[PDB]
Amino acid sequence: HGFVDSPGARNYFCGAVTKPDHVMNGVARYPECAGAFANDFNGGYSYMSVLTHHQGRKVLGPVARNVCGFDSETWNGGKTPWDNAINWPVNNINSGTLTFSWDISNGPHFDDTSDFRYWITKPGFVYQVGRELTWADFEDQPFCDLAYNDDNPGAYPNVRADKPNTHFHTTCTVPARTGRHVIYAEWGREPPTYERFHGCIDVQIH
Ligand SMILES: [Cu+2]
């Protein structure tokens, strides 16, 4: 159970940081989360639970009707808060080497993590409020596809478990891009669960 907190995913900003009730009370760090929680108030508190039990975009192909939530089981295979196309907060980043960090404090699965995978929107991508993502918006293959076996931490330098702070830190190379983009991210586990967690990261590349 967890989510990407650097660069912060939609369910970081609206979930881990800004809670539904914060928005209501007008005391939110991110008032723009109003739009994520407008039609699903209490689902906002399950930001760590955007999960499936299959091997994700790479293996099933572009099958899920909703990109960011990947038709999560927690929403009965329908839309999550983070599939909404609203005025999301954005991460300003550069192309090249970047750490993608998962906060797994809510449900660490160090021992049977299998993979981390990231896809990015195609160069021709135009972000627009109210227009929800399609798989056609993203490259077909992940730009970053990291195996892991906690038995042999040595063999995976691009994956770094931090057990005390219950984080995974992963290293990717974000490809040449500029402007507003989305990175779609997956954290997957081995059998027996095959559980997988899904996130979108809003980015402004330089
Ligand atoms: Cu979990």
Side-chain angles (χ1 to χ4, degrees), residues 1-64 66-127 129-206:
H1 278 69
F3 53 81
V4 177
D5 69 355
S6 186
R10 296 184 170 184
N11 55 324
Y12 168 74
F13 299 131
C14 307
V17 181
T18 287
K19 312 284 174 196
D21 223 72
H22 297 176
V23 173
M24 288 297 299
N25 292 304
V27 295
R29 172 71 170 81
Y30 297 110
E32 53 264 61
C33 296
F37 304 146
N39 292 118
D40 180 11
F41 185 83
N42 285 319
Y45 290 93
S46 295
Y47 52 95
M48 71 289 298
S49 308
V50 188
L51 71 91
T52 59
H53 287 99
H54 290 95
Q55 289 182 316
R57 172 65 180 71
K58 190 191 175 189
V59 168
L60 287 179
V63 299
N66 313 261
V67 170
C68 297
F70 207 88
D71 300 351
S72 173
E73 291 180 356
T74 300
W75 280 268
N76 300 129
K79 184 179 214 286
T80 75
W82 306 280
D83 296 304
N84 293 293
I86 60 159
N87 288 111
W88 292 101
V90 182
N91 298 283
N92 281 269
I93 63 164
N94 301 308
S95 286
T97 316
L98 188 61
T99 299
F100 291 77
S101 301
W102 294 81
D103 178 358
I104 71 172
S105 302
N106 300 123
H109 303 295
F110 283 108
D111 76 305
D112 64 0
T113 285
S114 61
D115 71 82
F116 308 82
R117 301 176 179 151
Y118 312 85
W119 289 251
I120 189 158
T121 42
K122 284 166 165 173
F125 177 72
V126 186
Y127 187 85
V129 172
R131 191 200 289 169
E132 293 182 0
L133 286 157
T134 82
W135 287 112
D137 290 343
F138 291 84
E139 293 181 347
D140 175 64
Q141 295 301 117
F143 65 91
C144 180
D145 181 6
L146 311 166
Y148 189 71
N149 186 334
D150 190 65
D151 294 338
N152 310 108
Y156 308 94
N158 288 316
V159 181
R160 281 153 282 130
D162 175 354
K163 288 155 190 276
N165 293 300
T166 49
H167 272 73
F168 270 116
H169 305 283
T170 64
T171 288
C172 297
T173 303
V174 165
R177 284 293 189 291
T178 68
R180 180 68 173 82
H181 285 275
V182 183
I183 296 166
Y184 165 78
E186 289 180 352
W187 164 43
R189 298 162 69 186
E190 299 170 348
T193 71
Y194 288 96
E195 186 170 55
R196 185 172 297 281
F197 296 87
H198 307 254
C200 279
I201 308 162
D202 298 290
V203 291
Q204 196 83 250
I205 322 290
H206 293 317

Short mmCIF file of all heavy atoms in Angstrom, two decimals, residues 142-190:
data_model
loop_
_atom_site.label_atom_id
_atom_site.label_comp_id
_atom_site.label_asym_id
_atom_site.label_seq_id
_atom_site.Cartn_x
_atom_site.Cartn_y
_atom_site.Cartn_z
N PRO A 142 7.15 1.45 -21.32
CA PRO A 142 7.63 2.27 -20.22
C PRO A 142 9.00 2.81 -20.59
O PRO A 142 9.81 2.10 -21.18
CB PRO A 142 7.68 1.31 -19.02
CG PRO A 142 7.89 -0.05 -19.65
CD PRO A 142 7.16 0.01 -20.99
N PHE A 143 9.27 4.07 -20.22
CA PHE A 143 10.61 4.61 -20.41
C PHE A 143 11.53 4.08 -19.30
O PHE A 143 12.74 4.22 -19.39
CB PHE A 143 10.64 6.13 -20.41
CG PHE A 143 10.25 6.78 -19.09
CD1 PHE A 143 11.21 7.07 -18.13
CD2 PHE A 143 8.93 7.11 -18.83
CE1 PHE A 143 10.85 7.68 -16.94
CE2 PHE A 143 8.58 7.71 -17.63
CZ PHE A 143 9.53 8.00 -16.69
N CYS A 144 10.94 3.49 -18.26
CA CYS A 144 11.69 3.05 -17.10
C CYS A 144 11.01 1.81 -16.51
O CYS A 144 9.88 1.89 -16.06
CB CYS A 144 11.74 4.17 -16.07
SG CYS A 144 12.65 3.74 -14.57
N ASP A 145 11.74 0.69 -16.52
CA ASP A 145 11.18 -0.62 -16.24
C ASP A 145 12.20 -1.39 -15.41
O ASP A 145 13.16 -1.93 -15.94
CB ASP A 145 10.82 -1.29 -17.56
CG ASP A 145 10.19 -2.68 -17.50
OD1 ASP A 145 9.90 -3.16 -16.38
OD2 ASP A 145 10.01 -3.26 -18.58
N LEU A 146 12.00 -1.40 -14.08
CA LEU A 146 13.00 -1.89 -13.15
C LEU A 146 12.49 -3.16 -12.49
O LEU A 146 11.43 -3.16 -11.86
CB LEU A 146 13.31 -0.81 -12.11
CG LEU A 146 13.58 0.59 -12.65
CD1 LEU A 146 13.53 1.61 -11.52
CD2 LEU A 146 14.92 0.65 -13.38
N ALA A 147 13.28 -4.23 -12.61
CA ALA A 147 13.01 -5.45 -11.87
C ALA A 147 13.53 -5.26 -10.44
O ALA A 147 14.25 -4.30 -10.16
CB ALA A 147 13.65 -6.63 -12.56
N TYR A 148 13.11 -6.16 -9.54
CA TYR A 148 13.60 -6.19 -8.18
C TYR A 148 13.36 -7.58 -7.61
O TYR A 148 12.35 -8.22 -7.92
CB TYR A 148 12.90 -5.16 -7.27
CG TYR A 148 13.52 -5.00 -5.89
CD1 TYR A 148 14.76 -4.39 -5.74
CD2 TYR A 148 12.87 -5.43 -4.74
CE1 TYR A 148 15.34 -4.23 -4.49
CE2 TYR A 148 13.44 -5.27 -3.48
CZ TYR A 148 14.68 -4.67 -3.36
OH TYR A 148 15.27 -4.49 -2.14
N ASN A 149 14.33 -8.02 -6.78
CA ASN A 149 14.22 -9.22 -5.96
C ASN A 149 14.93 -8.92 -4.65
O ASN A 149 16.15 -8.81 -4.61
CB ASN A 149 14.78 -10.45 -6.68
CG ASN A 149 14.56 -11.74 -5.92
OD1 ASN A 149 14.42 -11.73 -4.70
ND2 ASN A 149 14.53 -12.86 -6.63
N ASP A 150 14.15 -8.77 -3.57
CA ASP A 150 14.70 -8.32 -2.29
C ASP A 150 15.71 -9.32 -1.74
O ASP A 150 16.45 -8.99 -0.81
CB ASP A 150 13.60 -8.05 -1.28
CG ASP A 150 14.03 -7.35 -0.01
OD1 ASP A 150 14.47 -6.17 -0.10
OD2 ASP A 150 13.93 -7.98 1.07
N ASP A 151 15.72 -10.55 -2.27
CA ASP A 151 16.72 -11.55 -1.91
C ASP A 151 18.12 -11.05 -2.28
O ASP A 151 19.09 -11.31 -1.57
CB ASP A 151 16.46 -12.90 -2.55
CG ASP A 151 15.20 -13.64 -2.12
OD1 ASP A 151 14.67 -13.36 -1.02
OD2 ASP A 151 14.74 -14.52 -2.90
N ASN A 152 18.23 -10.33 -3.40
CA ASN A 152 19.52 -9.90 -3.92
C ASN A 152 19.51 -8.39 -4.12
O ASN A 152 19.56 -7.92 -5.26
CB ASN A 152 19.86 -10.62 -5.22
CG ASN A 152 19.68 -12.12 -5.10
OD1 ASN A 152 18.74 -12.67 -5.67
ND2 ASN A 152 20.57 -12.77 -4.37
N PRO A 153 19.48 -7.57 -3.04
CA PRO A 153 19.43 -6.11 -3.19
C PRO A 153 20.59 -5.58 -4.02
O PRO A 153 20.44 -4.59 -4.73
CB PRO A 153 19.46 -5.58 -1.74
CG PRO A 153 19.05 -6.76 -0.89
CD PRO A 153 19.50 -8.00 -1.64
N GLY A 154 21.75 -6.24 -3.90
CA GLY A 154 22.96 -5.90 -4.62
C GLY A 154 22.76 -5.82 -6.14
O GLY A 154 23.35 -4.96 -6.79
N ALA A 155 21.94 -6.70 -6.72
CA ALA A 155 21.84 -6.78 -8.17
C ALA A 155 20.92 -5.71 -8.76
O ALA A 155 20.76 -5.66 -9.98
CB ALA A 155 21.39 -8.17 -8.59
N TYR A 156 20.31 -4.84 -7.93
CA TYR A 156 19.39 -3.84 -8.45
C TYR A 156 19.76 -2.45 -7.93
O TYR A 156 19.06 -1.88 -7.09
CB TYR A 156 17.96 -4.24 -8.09
CG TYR A 156 17.60 -5.66 -8.50
CD1 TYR A 156 17.73 -6.70 -7.59
CD2 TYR A 156 17.14 -5.96 -9.78
CE1 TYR A 156 17.43 -8.00 -7.93
CE2 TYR A 156 16.84 -7.27 -10.14
CZ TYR A 156 16.98 -8.29 -9.21
OH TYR A 156 16.67 -9.59 -9.49
N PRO A 157 20.84 -1.82 -8.44
CA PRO A 157 21.28 -0.52 -7.94
C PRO A 157 20.26 0.59 -8.18
O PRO A 157 20.33 1.63 -7.54
CB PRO A 157 22.61 -0.23 -8.66
CG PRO A 157 22.95 -1.50 -9.41
CD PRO A 157 21.67 -2.31 -9.55
N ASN A 158 19.34 0.39 -9.13
CA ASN A 158 18.36 1.41 -9.48
C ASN A 158 17.14 1.35 -8.56
O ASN A 158 16.20 2.13 -8.74
CB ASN A 158 17.95 1.32 -10.95
CG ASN A 158 19.03 1.77 -11.89
OD1 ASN A 158 19.69 2.79 -11.66
ND2 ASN A 158 19.24 1.02 -12.97
N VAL A 159 17.12 0.39 -7.63
CA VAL A 159 16.08 0.27 -6.62
C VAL A 159 16.75 0.26 -5.25
O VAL A 159 17.66 -0.52 -5.00
CB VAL A 159 15.21 -0.99 -6.81
CG1 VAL A 159 14.11 -1.07 -5.76
CG2 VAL A 159 14.62 -1.07 -8.21
N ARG A 160 16.28 1.14 -4.37
CA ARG A 160 16.90 1.38 -3.08
C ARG A 160 15.81 1.35 -2.01
O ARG A 160 15.03 2.29 -1.91
CB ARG A 160 17.63 2.73 -3.09
CG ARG A 160 18.98 2.70 -3.79
CD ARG A 160 19.38 4.05 -4.38
NE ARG A 160 18.67 4.30 -5.64
CZ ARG A 160 17.99 5.39 -5.96
NH1 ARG A 160 18.10 6.51 -5.25
NH2 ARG A 160 17.24 5.38 -7.04
N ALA A 161 15.75 0.25 -1.26
CA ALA A 161 14.86 0.14 -0.12
C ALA A 161 15.41 0.97 1.04
O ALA A 161 16.59 0.90 1.37
CB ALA A 161 14.70 -1.31 0.27
N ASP A 162 14.53 1.81 1.62
CA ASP A 162 14.80 2.48 2.88
C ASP A 162 13.78 1.94 3.89
O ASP A 162 12.63 2.39 3.91
CB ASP A 162 14.77 3.99 2.71
CG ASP A 162 14.90 4.83 3.98
OD1 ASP A 162 14.92 4.27 5.09
OD2 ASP A 162 14.97 6.07 3.84
N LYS A 163 14.21 0.98 4.71
CA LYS A 163 13.28 0.27 5.58
C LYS A 163 12.86 1.18 6.74
O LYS A 163 11.66 1.34 6.95
CB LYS A 163 13.84 -1.10 5.98
CG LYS A 163 13.84 -2.09 4.82
CD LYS A 163 14.88 -3.18 4.96
CE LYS A 163 15.03 -4.00 3.72
NZ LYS A 163 14.03 -5.06 3.66
N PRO A 164 13.78 1.84 7.48
CA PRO A 164 13.38 2.75 8.55
C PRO A 164 12.30 3.77 8.17
O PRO A 164 11.36 3.99 8.94
CB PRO A 164 14.71 3.42 8.93
CG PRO A 164 15.74 2.34 8.65
CD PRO A 164 15.25 1.72 7.35
N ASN A 165 12.39 4.34 6.96
CA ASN A 165 11.45 5.35 6.50
C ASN A 165 10.45 4.78 5.50
O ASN A 165 9.76 5.54 4.83
CB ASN A 165 12.19 6.56 5.93
CG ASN A 165 12.94 7.29 7.01
OD1 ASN A 165 12.32 7.75 7.97
ND2 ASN A 165 14.26 7.33 6.92
N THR A 166 10.37 3.44 5.41
CA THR A 166 9.41 2.72 4.59
C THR A 166 9.17 3.46 3.27
O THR A 166 8.05 3.87 2.95
CB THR A 166 8.12 2.47 5.36
OG1 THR A 166 7.70 3.68 5.98
CG2 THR A 166 8.31 1.45 6.46
N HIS A 167 10.27 3.60 2.52
CA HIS A 167 10.25 4.10 1.16
C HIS A 167 11.04 3.15 0.26
O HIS A 167 11.97 2.49 0.71
CB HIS A 167 10.90 5.49 1.07
CG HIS A 167 9.98 6.64 1.31
ND1 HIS A 167 9.50 6.96 2.56
CD2 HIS A 167 9.48 7.56 0.48
CE1 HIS A 167 8.74 8.04 2.47
NE2 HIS A 167 8.71 8.43 1.23
N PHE A 168 10.61 3.07 -1.01
CA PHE A 168 11.46 2.64 -2.11
C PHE A 168 11.89 3.88 -2.88
O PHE A 168 11.07 4.75 -3.16
CB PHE A 168 10.71 1.71 -3.08
CG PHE A 168 10.78 0.23 -2.78
CD1 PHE A 168 9.64 -0.50 -2.46
CD2 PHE A 168 11.98 -0.47 -2.89
CE1 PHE A 168 9.70 -1.86 -2.22
CE2 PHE A 168 12.04 -1.83 -2.65
CZ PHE A 168 10.91 -2.52 -2.29
N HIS A 169 13.18 3.93 -3.24
CA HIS A 169 13.70 4.97 -4.12
C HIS A 169 14.22 4.31 -5.40
O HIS A 169 15.08 3.44 -5.33
CB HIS A 169 14.79 5.79 -3.43
CG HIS A 169 14.37 6.41 -2.14
ND1 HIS A 169 13.57 7.53 -2.08
CD2 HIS A 169 14.61 6.04 -0.87
CE1 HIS A 169 13.34 7.83 -0.81
NE2 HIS A 169 13.97 6.95 -0.06
N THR A 170 13.68 4.73 -6.55
CA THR A 170 13.99 4.14 -7.85
C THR A 170 14.61 5.21 -8.75
O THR A 170 14.31 6.39 -8.60
CB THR A 170 12.73 3.53 -8.46
OG1 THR A 170 11.79 4.58 -8.71
CG2 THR A 170 12.07 2.50 -7.55
N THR A 171 15.52 4.80 -9.64
CA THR A 171 16.23 5.71 -10.53
C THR A 171 15.76 5.46 -11.96
O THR A 171 15.81 4.34 -12.43
CB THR A 171 17.73 5.48 -10.41
OG1 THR A 171 18.18 5.99 -9.16
CG2 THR A 171 18.50 6.17 -11.53
N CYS A 172 15.29 6.52 -12.62
CA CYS A 172 14.87 6.45 -14.01
C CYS A 172 15.59 7.55 -14.79
O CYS A 172 16.17 8.46 -14.21
CB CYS A 172 13.38 6.66 -14.17
SG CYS A 172 12.36 5.39 -13.38
N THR A 173 15.57 7.42 -16.12
CA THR A 173 16.02 8.47 -17.01
C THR A 173 14.78 9.00 -17.73
O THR A 173 14.22 8.32 -18.59
CB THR A 173 17.07 7.91 -17.96
OG1 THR A 173 18.08 7.39 -17.11
CG2 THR A 173 17.67 8.95 -18.89
N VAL A 174 14.32 10.20 -17.32
CA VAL A 174 13.20 10.84 -17.98
C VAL A 174 13.69 11.32 -19.35
O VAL A 174 14.70 12.00 -19.44
CB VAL A 174 12.60 11.99 -17.14
CG1 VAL A 174 11.68 12.90 -17.93
CG2 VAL A 174 11.86 11.46 -15.92
N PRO A 175 13.02 10.94 -20.47
CA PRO A 175 13.52 11.27 -21.80
C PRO A 175 13.27 12.72 -22.17
O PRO A 175 12.41 13.37 -21.57
CB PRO A 175 12.73 10.29 -22.70
CG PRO A 175 11.41 10.14 -22.00
CD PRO A 175 11.76 10.17 -20.51
N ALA A 176 14.04 13.21 -23.15
CA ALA A 176 13.88 14.54 -23.70
C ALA A 176 12.41 14.87 -23.89
O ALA A 176 11.69 14.15 -24.58
CB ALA A 176 14.64 14.66 -25.00
N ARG A 177 11.98 15.95 -23.24
CA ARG A 177 10.61 16.44 -23.28
C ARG A 177 10.64 17.90 -22.83
O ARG A 177 11.56 18.30 -22.13
CB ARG A 177 9.68 15.71 -22.30
CG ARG A 177 9.23 14.31 -22.68
CD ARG A 177 8.33 14.36 -23.89
NE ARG A 177 7.69 13.07 -24.17
CZ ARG A 177 8.33 11.99 -24.59
NH1 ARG A 177 9.63 12.02 -24.80
NH2 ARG A 177 7.66 10.88 -24.82
N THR A 178 9.63 18.67 -23.24
CA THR A 178 9.40 19.98 -22.65
C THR A 178 7.89 20.21 -22.58
O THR A 178 7.13 19.63 -23.36
CB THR A 178 10.10 21.10 -23.42
OG1 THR A 178 9.43 21.17 -24.68
CG2 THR A 178 11.59 20.89 -23.59
N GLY A 179 7.48 21.05 -21.63
CA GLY A 179 6.08 21.42 -21.47
C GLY A 179 5.39 20.54 -20.44
O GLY A 179 6.04 19.81 -19.69
N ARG A 180 4.05 20.62 -20.43
CA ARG A 180 3.20 19.90 -19.52
C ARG A 180 3.11 18.44 -19.97
O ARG A 180 2.80 18.17 -21.14
CB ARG A 180 1.86 20.66 -19.55
CG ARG A 180 0.74 20.12 -18.67
CD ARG A 180 1.06 20.28 -17.20
NE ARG A 180 -0.06 19.94 -16.33
CZ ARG A 180 -0.43 18.72 -15.94
NH1 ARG A 180 0.28 17.65 -16.30
NH2 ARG A 180 -1.49 18.58 -15.17
N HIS A 181 3.39 17.50 -19.05
CA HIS A 181 3.32 16.07 -19.33
C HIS A 181 2.75 15.33 -18.12
O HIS A 181 2.56 15.92 -17.05
CB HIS A 181 4.70 15.57 -19.76
CG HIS A 181 5.00 15.97 -21.17
ND1 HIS A 181 4.57 15.24 -22.25
CD2 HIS A 181 5.63 17.04 -21.67
CE1 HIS A 181 4.96 15.85 -23.36
NE2 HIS A 181 5.59 16.95 -23.03
N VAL A 182 2.43 14.04 -18.33
CA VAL A 182 2.02 13.13 -17.27
C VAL A 182 2.93 11.91 -17.31
O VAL A 182 3.20 11.37 -18.39
CB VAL A 182 0.54 12.73 -17.35
CG1 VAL A 182 0.13 11.83 -16.19
CG2 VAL A 182 -0.38 13.95 -17.39
N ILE A 183 3.40 11.48 -16.12
CA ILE A 183 4.05 10.19 -15.92
C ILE A 183 3.12 9.25 -15.16
O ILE A 183 2.64 9.56 -14.06
CB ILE A 183 5.41 10.38 -15.23
CG1 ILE A 183 6.37 11.17 -16.12
CG2 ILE A 183 6.04 9.05 -14.82
CD1 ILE A 183 7.60 11.70 -15.42
N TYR A 184 2.85 8.10 -15.78
CA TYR A 184 2.02 7.05 -15.20
C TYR A 184 2.95 6.00 -14.59
O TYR A 184 3.89 5.56 -15.26
CB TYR A 184 1.11 6.45 -16.27
CG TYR A 184 0.50 5.13 -15.84
CD1 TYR A 184 -0.58 5.08 -14.97
CD2 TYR A 184 1.02 3.92 -16.29
CE1 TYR A 184 -1.11 3.87 -14.55
CE2 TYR A 184 0.50 2.71 -15.88
CZ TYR A 184 -0.58 2.68 -15.02
OH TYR A 184 -1.09 1.47 -14.63
N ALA A 185 2.70 5.63 -13.32
CA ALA A 185 3.65 4.82 -12.56
C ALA A 185 2.96 3.60 -11.95
O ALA A 185 1.81 3.66 -11.52
CB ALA A 185 4.30 5.67 -11.50
N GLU A 186 3.73 2.51 -11.86
CA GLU A 186 3.28 1.25 -11.28
C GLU A 186 4.33 0.70 -10.31
O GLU A 186 5.52 0.73 -10.61
CB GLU A 186 3.08 0.17 -12.34
CG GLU A 186 1.86 0.44 -13.21
CD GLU A 186 1.64 -0.63 -14.25
OE1 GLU A 186 2.53 -1.51 -14.40
OE2 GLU A 186 0.57 -0.57 -14.88
N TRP A 187 3.85 0.17 -9.18
CA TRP A 187 4.65 -0.62 -8.26
C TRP A 187 3.98 -1.99 -8.11
O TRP A 187 2.85 -2.08 -7.63
CB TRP A 187 4.78 0.15 -6.93
CG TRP A 187 5.23 -0.67 -5.76
CD1 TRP A 187 6.22 -1.61 -5.74
CD2 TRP A 187 4.71 -0.61 -4.41
NE1 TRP A 187 6.33 -2.16 -4.49
CE2 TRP A 187 5.43 -1.55 -3.65
CE3 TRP A 187 3.73 0.16 -3.78
CZ2 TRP A 187 5.18 -1.76 -2.30
CZ3 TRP A 187 3.50 -0.02 -2.43
CH2 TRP A 187 4.21 -0.98 -1.71
N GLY A 188 4.67 -3.05 -8.56
CA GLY A 188 4.10 -4.38 -8.66
C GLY A 188 4.77 -5.37 -7.70
O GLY A 188 5.92 -5.18 -7.31
N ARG A 189 4.02 -6.42 -7.31
CA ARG A 189 4.54 -7.48 -6.45
C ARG A 189 4.49 -8.83 -7.17
O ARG A 189 3.70 -9.05 -8.09
CB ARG A 189 3.77 -7.62 -5.13
CG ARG A 189 3.82 -6.40 -4.22
CD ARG A 189 2.71 -6.44 -3.19
NE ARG A 189 2.91 -7.51 -2.21
CZ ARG A 189 2.05 -7.86 -1.27
NH1 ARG A 189 0.89 -7.25 -1.15
NH2 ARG A 189 2.37 -8.82 -0.42
N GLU A 190 5.34 -9.75 -6.68
CA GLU A 190 5.39 -11.14 -7.11
C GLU A 190 4.10 -11.88 -6.74
O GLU A 190 3.23 -11.35 -6.04
CB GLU A 190 6.53 -11.82 -6.34
CG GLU A 190 7.92 -11.23 -6.60
CD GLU A 190 9.00 -11.74 -5.65
OE1 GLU A 190 8.67 -12.40 -4.62
OE2 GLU A 190 10.18 -11.47 -5.94
#
